[PDB]
Symmetry: D2
Subunit: 109 residues, 4 copies
Amino acid sequence: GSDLVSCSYRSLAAPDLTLRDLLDIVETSQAHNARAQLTGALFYSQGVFFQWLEGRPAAVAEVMTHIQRDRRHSNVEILAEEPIAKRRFAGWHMQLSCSEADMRSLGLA
Amino acid sequence: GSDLVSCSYRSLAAPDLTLRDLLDIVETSQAHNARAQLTGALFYSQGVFFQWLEGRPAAVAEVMTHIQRDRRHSNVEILAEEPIAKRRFAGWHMQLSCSEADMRSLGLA
Amino acid sequence: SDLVSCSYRSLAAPDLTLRDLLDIVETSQAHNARAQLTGALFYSQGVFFQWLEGRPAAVAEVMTHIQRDRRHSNVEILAEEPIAKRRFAGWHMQLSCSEADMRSLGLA
Amino acid sequence: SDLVSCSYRSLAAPDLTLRDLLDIVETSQAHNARAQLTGALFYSQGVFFQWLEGRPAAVAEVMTHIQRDRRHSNVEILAEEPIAKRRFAGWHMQLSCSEADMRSLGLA
Ligand SMILES: Cc1cc2nc3c(=O)[nH]c(=O)nc-3n(C[C@H](O)[C@H](O)[C@H](O)COP(=O)(O)O)c2cc1C
Ligand SMILES: Cc1cc2nc3c(=O)[nH]c(=O)nc-3n(C[C@H](O)[C@H](O)[C@H](O)COP(=O)(O)O)c2cc1C
Ligand SMILES: Cc1cc2nc3c(=O)[nH]c(=O)nc-3n(C[C@H](O)[C@H](O)[C@H](O)COP(=O)(O)O)c2cc1C
Ligand SMILES: Cc1cc2nc3c(=O)[nH]c(=O)nc-3n(C[C@H](O)[C@H](O)[C@H](O)COP(=O)(O)O)c2cc1C
């Protein structure tokens, strides 16, 4: 609605990140983002995360304080809140992008 | 080279198939197909497998006798050997196709 | 208790383009929604695999069209099975197409 | 001991097409192979995220071109980090682009 903001960041996955860790992150994010009216997209490849999160300012800032402390990634490199006129990922609580090749290495680890 | 054949089949995944089962299949297939000069593609979605396997007749037929007995799928619905003029998936021992959504359900199970 | 699936493999027309693939998918979304068909289309390196599910009569009807479609040939020993329930509910036609294949089809 | 990465997020031109995306990727394969750059390009719903890695001088050079490229805007607080080793060796530019986004860009 009226007040909508986006947050974008790039982080580095913990060296020991497993496939189960990624699925945990995604399941956790589905449940919470749906309750908090947060949407966006999570991209994972070869130890690199990129996330776009969108919603009201408070929900975005509250979820980001937790994401920054999460021990499954480091070097969280943030882009200040940008005002947005409308959601880009409406109905996607957290859309995952993860190739078969990344699935294979995360699993075989 | 000279004598090349393809084999195509559709099967139904075991109801209890996990993400680990899929990764096992794929790892197993990478190692063997590279030794036996077999190439192709494996597609998985929502309890359905499709595979294209290609190489010399003997390697193709030997690997298929094992795939048919594999308890991780059933109802293996085969297409007789087709002669092919050249490989379609050269250098791909077993290319996997598996969406994020299928990764999520296989994991959350 | 009245669902059937049809499964086949075909070989794409050698001159198939990314536009052709997109058209196939957009046409299928539209007819399948209307005819209560669901399923999955896989494309890689000149090969189609398709799983189609619905009422016998609806599956039979699209298949007669699909089989004569000129964007593929060698539509093969189509495998027809009764099913207890849909595998692809919600998916009028789910496309599977890798970035590498998108790039290849795109090369025109 | 002489590798750097540049990471940014940008917003695609509203009129971006699938052809535009394909061109970007084909251009990048070619220059990146030659300039010893590797990395990953992610596209979804009007948003680019890119990770680029290589020697400082090569990363600096493409970035000046990428930043003025008209197929995107709001090229954002590009995040520049020294790295111990490449994350995307072998990938001159790996594209990530879902079937749903391919369909959308295709709608022209
Ligand atoms: C890369 C990454 C992205 C994440 N994205 C979200 C998210 O979008 N929404 C969310 O609620 N938690 C997300 N998390 C998880 C949160 O950091 C944190 O774990 C959350 O507060 C509760 O999850 P937990 O119960 O596992 O600690 C993410 C974690 C990582 C490492
Ligand atoms: C859907 C599916 C596809 C498979 N594809 C191959 C394959 O292409 N190459 C191969 O060597 N084994 C493949 N397998 C595994 C074989 O059936 C069989 O397991 C193999 O002989 C040895 O694997 P195992 O040591 O786990 O039994 C496949 C299994 C399944 C269920
Ligand atoms: C590999 C392949 C798969 C197809 N799958 C479907 C499908 O599931 N549903 C459908 O309506 N058309 C499908 N088509 C397209 C049909 O062959 C046919 O073009 C369409 O039903 C008629 O299009 P029109 O009546 O709008 O002109 C497929 C075509 C190809 C080549
Ligand atoms: C989102 C985005 C990412 C790009 N990434 C690269 C890249 O990694 N390497 C590259 O050479 N060009 C990349 N480009 C294209 C460059 O901006 C520029 O067009 C190119 O270097 C010059 O093309 P030309 O000299 O062949 O005409 C990218 C463009 C966009 C919009």
